[PDB]
């Protein structure tokens, strides 16, 4: 996988507090580039990356039109879902959608995606064939039947093989300075005594892009998988990410431990010691 484009929609009902909220975000790789929020004073598809700003008003109007229409449709989907699960109109529920395309270094489609969740649980997904569906439950089977009847998969396929890949390629070119630049992690090991007998070694990775990274501690060359505390990769707020991995070690055994760092921005994996 060289690059991806993904759109994420969340539709959230809130009975008694107006119509369900609809929020959409678009990403290329780990870079957000657009958003829409139906609760905004003036809802529009709005830029979130500099390289998208150059798109003309027909782009922005068209995306806004789409997001408004999408909000209406997902409000209706929330109503339908209530019926499919025999649920009360008094509770709050959420539909999420993810879709997009992955392309190789040559820009050809590697694979397409279109998945839905209801209340945080898988609902229905387009299969890798971009032709058939996997329904999670008997409610989603009803949708599957309707979508098989309407040849919905063919529509997604046409988008995923066509416009998705074409627009992704455009974005990758317009944003080439950043979207096509890996920033390797800045790495170091810190040492924190806990007692006379043990200390924590923490291996840091900072300022990296994209988010994908592997940090592993070895003791005498053996992966310490079960004994390593690994925090979730976290955004720094400047486009880059941070992560650490820690192990508790016997005092005076520090040199038996090595931190190993793999990242796409590194020509070779790194080995660090305290």
């Amino acid at each position: 996988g060289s690059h991806s484009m993904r759109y994420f929609y969340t539709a959230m009902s809130r009975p008694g507090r107006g119509e369900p909220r609809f929020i959409a975000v678009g990403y290329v790789d780990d870079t957000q580039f657009v958003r829409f929020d139906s609760d905004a004073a003036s809802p529009r598809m709005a830029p979130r990356a500099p390289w998208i700003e150059q798109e003309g008003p027909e782009y922005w109007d068209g995306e806004t039109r789409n997001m408004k229409a999408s909000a209406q449709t997902y409000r209706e989907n929330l109503r339908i879902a209530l019926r499919y699960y025999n649920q009360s109109e008094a509770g709050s529920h959420i539909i999420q959608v993810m879709y997009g395309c992955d392309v190789g270094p040559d820009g050809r489609l590697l694979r397409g995606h279109n998945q839905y969740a209801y209340d945080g649980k898988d609902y229905i997904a387009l299969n890798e064939d971009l032709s058939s569906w996997t329904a999670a439950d008997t409610a989603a089977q009803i949708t599957q039947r309707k979508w098989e009847a309407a040849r919905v998969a063919e529509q997604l396929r046409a988008y995923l093989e066509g416009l998705c890949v074409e627009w992704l390629r455009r974005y990758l070119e317009n944003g080439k300075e950043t979207l096509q630049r890996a920033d390797p992690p800045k790495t170091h090991v810190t040492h924190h005594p806990i007692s006379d007998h043990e200390a924590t070694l923490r291996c840091w990775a900072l300022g990296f892009y994209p988010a994908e990274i592997t940090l592993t501690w070895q003791r005498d060359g053996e992966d310490q998988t079960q004994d390593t505390e690994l925090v979730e990769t976290r955004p720094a707020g400047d486009r880059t990410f941070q992560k650490w991995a820690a192990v508790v070690v016997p005092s005076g055994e520090e040199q038996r431990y090595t931190c190993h760092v793999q990242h796409e921005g590194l020509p070779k994996p790194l080995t660090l010691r305290w």
Binding site: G26, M45, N77, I80, Y84, Y99, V152, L163, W167
Partner: peptide
Amino acid sequence: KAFSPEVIPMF
């Protein structure tokens, strides 16, 4: 650019 079907699929 977002997916924009003539008819947006309903559940």
